[PDB]
Amino acid sequence: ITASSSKEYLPDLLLFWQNYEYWITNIGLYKTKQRDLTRTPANLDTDTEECMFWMNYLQKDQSFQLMNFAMENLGALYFGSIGDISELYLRVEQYWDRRADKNHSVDGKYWDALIWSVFTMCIYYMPVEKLAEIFSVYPLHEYLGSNKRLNWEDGMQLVMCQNFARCSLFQLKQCDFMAHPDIRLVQAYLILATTTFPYDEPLLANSLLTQCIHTFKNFHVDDFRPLLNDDPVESIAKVTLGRIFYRLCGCDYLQSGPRKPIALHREENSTEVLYWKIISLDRDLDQYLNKSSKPPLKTLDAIRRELDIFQYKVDSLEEDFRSNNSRFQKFIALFQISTVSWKLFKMYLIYYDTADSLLKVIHYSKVIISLIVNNFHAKSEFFNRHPMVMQTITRVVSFISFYQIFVESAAVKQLLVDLTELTANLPTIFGSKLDKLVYLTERLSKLKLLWDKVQLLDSGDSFYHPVFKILQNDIKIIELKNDEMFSLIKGLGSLVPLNSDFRTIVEEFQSEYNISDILS
Amino acid sequence: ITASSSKEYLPDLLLFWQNYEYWITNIGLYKTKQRDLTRTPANLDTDTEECMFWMNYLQKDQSFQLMNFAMENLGALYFGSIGDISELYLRVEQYWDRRADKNHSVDGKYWDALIWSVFTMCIYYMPVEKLAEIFSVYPLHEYLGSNKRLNWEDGMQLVMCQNFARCSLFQLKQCDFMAHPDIRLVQAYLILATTTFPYDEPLLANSLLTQCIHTFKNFHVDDFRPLLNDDPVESIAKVTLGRIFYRLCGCDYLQSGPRKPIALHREENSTEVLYWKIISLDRDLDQYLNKSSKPPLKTLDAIRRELDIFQYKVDSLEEDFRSNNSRFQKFIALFQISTVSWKLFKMYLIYYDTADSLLKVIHYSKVIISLIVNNFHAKSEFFNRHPMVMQTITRVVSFISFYQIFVESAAVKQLLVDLTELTANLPTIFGSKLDKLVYLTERLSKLKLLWDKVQLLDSGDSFYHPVFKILQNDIKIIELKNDEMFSLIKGLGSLVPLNSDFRTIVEEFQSEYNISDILS
Numbered sequence A, B: 001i002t003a004s005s006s007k008e009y010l011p012d013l014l015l016f017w018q019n020y021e022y023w024i025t026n027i028g029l030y031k032t033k034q035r036d037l038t039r040t041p042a043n044l045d046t047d048t049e050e051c052m053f054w055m056n057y058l059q060k061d062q063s064f065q066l067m068n069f070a071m072e073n074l075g076a077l078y079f080g081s082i083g084d085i086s087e088l089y090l091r092v093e094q095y096w097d098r099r100a101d102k103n104h105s106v107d108g109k110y111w112d113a114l115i116w117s118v119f120t121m122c123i124y125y126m127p128v129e130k131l132a133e134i135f136s137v138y139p140l141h142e143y144l145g146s147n148k149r150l151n152w153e154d155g156m157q158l159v160m161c162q163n164f165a166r167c168s169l170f171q172l173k174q175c176d177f178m179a180h181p182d183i184r185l186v187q188a189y190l191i192l193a194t195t196t197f198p199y200d201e202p203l204l205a206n207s208l209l210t211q212c213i214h215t216f217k218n219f220h221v222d223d224f225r226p227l228l229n230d231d232p233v234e235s236i237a238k239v240t241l242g243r244i245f246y247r248l249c250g251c252d253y254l255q256s257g258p259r260k261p262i263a264l265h266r267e268e269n270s271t272e273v274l275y276w277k278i279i280s281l282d283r284d285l286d287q288y289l290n291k292s293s294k295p296p297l298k299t300l301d302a303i304r305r306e307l308d309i310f311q312y313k314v315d316s317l318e319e320d321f322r323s324n325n326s327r328f329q330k331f332i333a334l335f336q337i338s339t340v341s342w343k344l345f346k347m348y349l350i351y352y353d354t355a356d357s358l359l360k361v362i363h364y365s366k367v368i369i370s371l372i373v374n375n376f377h378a379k380s381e382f383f384n385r386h387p388m389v390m391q392t393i394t395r396v397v398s399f400i401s402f403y404q405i406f407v408e409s410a411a412v413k414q415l416l417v418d419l420t421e422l423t424a425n426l427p428t429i430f431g432s433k434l435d436k437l438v439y440l441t442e443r444l445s446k447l448k449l450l451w452d453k454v455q456l457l458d459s460g461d462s463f464y465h466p467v468f469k470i471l472q473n474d475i476k477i478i479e480l481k482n483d484e485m486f487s488l489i490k491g492l493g494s495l496v497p498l499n500s501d502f503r504t505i506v507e508e509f510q511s512e513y514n515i516s517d518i519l520s
């Protein structure tokens, strides 16, 4: 092993990105939640106490203002799940007609759970200004015991959203949903999944998704196309179930990981078709992240051809600037397609170093930045709260940071500054996940520093560097935090398992920048 | 269509048994529970109130008497799930050490849920005399408001069992089990599944099973064999998980039906191996029940060869009459193997009219009767409470009743009287399911009467008879009660769907003997 100025390490280093992105930026950052059950409080009360307060807090006038907000801005998010929101107003009325009742039917409780999941979505997306005009923060501190000086914009809106989600589940529990499979469970879940709920509670969300898969399959409808011999009411139920199935598929893919072992496997719902096709393209690409095989060039070209077809349909979508439902829909479709585009070219770059790959990568990252920044012109700012922008930004700023470490490029260097800057401006509704991403970004930059300030080595057979070991350790540490063997051993009984300057740099860096800090 | 004395209808009539047995005696009788959600009370309280009483009712001295009973009689039922019961005593101690605590950890609550599922099993199997010596019925009526004149043997033991099951689930809910996957959920379920719980609550049980499948898979252990590089504690956890997996598979098969769409797919645990092999043989056979294809003769012979191998191992099991754990184990293995034997020959008879088939069918039904009657010599009477005897008796008495209708045989005629008699003597712990089976039996007998008192017709192309139509209608009615399209339509909104003397006999019989009466 001697000194080296070689570079035949880069190819395998870019191959290694795929895995890093999967374990660190995806699994570790969003789906890894440490669970020490011996120090976790049980819900003796089963949230009865908590939801007594939140449900009394919400007043009738306010609940209809949440519906109006949904009815006017969020159609692109809820249509696939609940369809037209008009009959849901009747459900809010009935919720209030029965709010005083001492006896409720499971049926009624399912509708309540559903509208409450909608209220949750509403709280999650509503601009803090509109939220302030409707609700008073003080009754919250009054009950929570939090600082009365903290306002809605200080993390209180996120707290109200998280509790509205909890009460939506509380009402499902009052339905004894496990003994009464109903399509409303899937619909409620679908609506909660438009928020960061699946990120706040990955295991709970994965269990709930499994229940939705069970609920769906429980209908035994494998063909959603209306049949001549069908009662129109039955044809409508199947077209609706079909849209739900596809939104479900969307969640199934987004919640993929070791903690989610069970897999699902015209006009406005022509958009529903477009939304699924774009996500399936995203899946077709990211399936290679944790795989060791390389996608064949001809496979990427095939995906590219479909991408151009969908980019055309996405661009043919007329967006009515007067209608905010239309605008959000355009933004969502445009962002999804750019994300898939960014990924396609990242893979062309990484696997085949294809001509123009980097240029394309730079361009779709800017398109992505541009789309987010375009909403900073308020009345659309809340569009940026969509979980997809957090996911997309995470992949982009992380890969660029990593690419910046090994490859010299002023264009990429400037892109990183813009990316780093935009990240800091993302909606605070993304909570601690946003701080963790900022942290992950600084750590990667600090990792570039180290790469510069230390000489690469070569045993003539393999290369060596502290940065390599550290990156390799990151994946190992997060893989280990996802091994359930430990919780298995702890659940079965009281048995407990027993079993160079280069090493000083690795440990030094890690105790200063613990990768475990991106976890939950 | 003219009169007929033909008999070339029997072959297809026996083929038709397979389906009848699947839909009527299996799906309809044990896995069909009508659910009108608009008239079903929600659990606003989430069982808090109910389990406050039951958990205070059970006293420490009594809880250890349940463990002793389990430790002394039920090892064959719980070993595969919880292994050796010795460390579970420590858990009962801890349950009492913390019974007064106002704060509990999720970990502690999981152990509580587990021992309570065990208490449930205990109540389900304990001889009413031993139960009476331990508990006082009066505090129950006092709280339930039921007739104070009703004693333990009057359906009160079954009520205490059903509520112990409810509180076992109540404590799992306090664990927020969906957010904390733990092997104890599977183990608790496994223990509850040794009782009739899965029959009382088919949908809830199927949802819980789905959660166990998710919990299991969540460990990502596909190989249970200990490895050289393994920590002994880790090797032990895998051997244990392996036994759990197989017991699970057992439940997965037993709970098969349209309401369970998600599928799992040395010494004392050498018995565990034997238990699974015999059940998989049972599955290999009954998979043809609702299939239209016929099992190839060579396939039945293959199953027969394995059956003789296992019948030898089952017979090589030494049973210590001094040890009741040993005796129950012998009974269980002997009963399972006879059940599989009975089914093998029923299929030889039905599909190929094989030589001696009927004789063999008659003999294994007597072996089966004999095994149950053999326990009426008390101190083993409670062995008959095993869900398997209810299932097996159901298949036997039903097929014999049906066979008695079309084929003349004094031997079978006497067997039906003995079967009909034994049914009436089965443990009352089987509740309303027992009355429904007795009812189904009378209906089939009344159906023989009708067959005798009415002439068969022949259109020269097909045969006709009221009995045929009625039997065909039974399957159709139960298939319809298992179509979830109705509940789908009701969950999505307010839309509601619109869409001869021979016919007088069919309707006459049905309004007098409604097949729907075997449902729950």
Ligand SMILES: C[As](C)(=O)[O-]
Pocket (backbone or CB within 6 Å): A304, A305, A307, A308, A341
């Ligand atoms: C227009 As293209 C995404 O095939 O370069």
Ligand SMILES: C[As](C)(=O)[O-]
Pocket (backbone or CB within 6 Å): B304, B305, B307, B308, B341
């Ligand atoms: C001894 As045999 C069950 O093959 O007849």
